[PDB]
């Protein structure tokens, strides 16, 4: 679809059998979720944003469905004010910004 930006660009996601919403964030390199626990091994990772740095868990080769589209990629689990879908997965959707 094509969406304008008068409201926050929020989509539905499915991961590990659970449903959540997430913000499509062109300003995010990576995808970060807070309200999901994933199984198996992970590695510590550090991320930064407006208010400083967060330690998160990095999960690799995670199945995730974003607005209907099934992809597999890296998902970070940790504190964030909002679940966010970053460019790592938006590239898999063929997303573009148009102005």
Ligand X SMILES: CCCC[C@@H](CN[C@@H](CCCC)C(=O)N[C@@H](CCC(N)=O)C(=O)N[C@@H](CCCNC(N)=[NH2+])C(N)=O)NC(=O)[C@@H](NC(=O)[C@@H](NC(C)=O)[C@@H](C)O)[C@@H](C)CC
> Which residues make up the interface to ligand X (CB under 6 A)?
23, 25, 27-30, 32, 47-50, 80-82, 84, 86
**Cβ at position 88, least distance to ligand X in Å:** 8
Task: List the single partner that 71 binds among a copy of itself, ligand X, none, CB under 5 to 8 Å by kind.
Answer: none
Report the distance separating Cα 72 and Cα 78, nearest Å: 19
25 in active site: yes
For the bound state, the minimum distance from the C-beta of residue 87 to ligand X, rounded and expressed in Å, comes to 8
Name residues whose C-beta falls within 8 Å of residue 36's C-beta, 6 or more positions apart in sequence: 15, 16, 18, 20, 77, 83
Per partner kind, with CB cut-offs from 5 to 8 A, the member of ligand X, a copy of itself, none near residue 21 is: none
Contact 65, 14 (CB under 8 A): yes
Question: Which residues are known catalytic residues?
Answer: 25
């Amino acid at each position: 679809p094509q969406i304008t930006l008068w409201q926050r660009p929020i989509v539905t996601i499915k991961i590990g059998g659970q449903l959540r919403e997430a913000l499509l964030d062109t300003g995010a390199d990576d995808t970060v979720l807070e309200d999901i626990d994933l199984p198996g091994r992970w590695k510590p990772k550090l991320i930064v944003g407006i208010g400083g740095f967060v330690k998160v868990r990095q999960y690799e080769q995670v199945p995730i469905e974003i607005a209907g589209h099934k992809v597999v990629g890296t998902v970070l689990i940790g504190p964030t004010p909002s679940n966010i879908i970053g460019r790592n997965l938006m590239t898999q959707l063929g997303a573009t910004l148009n102005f």
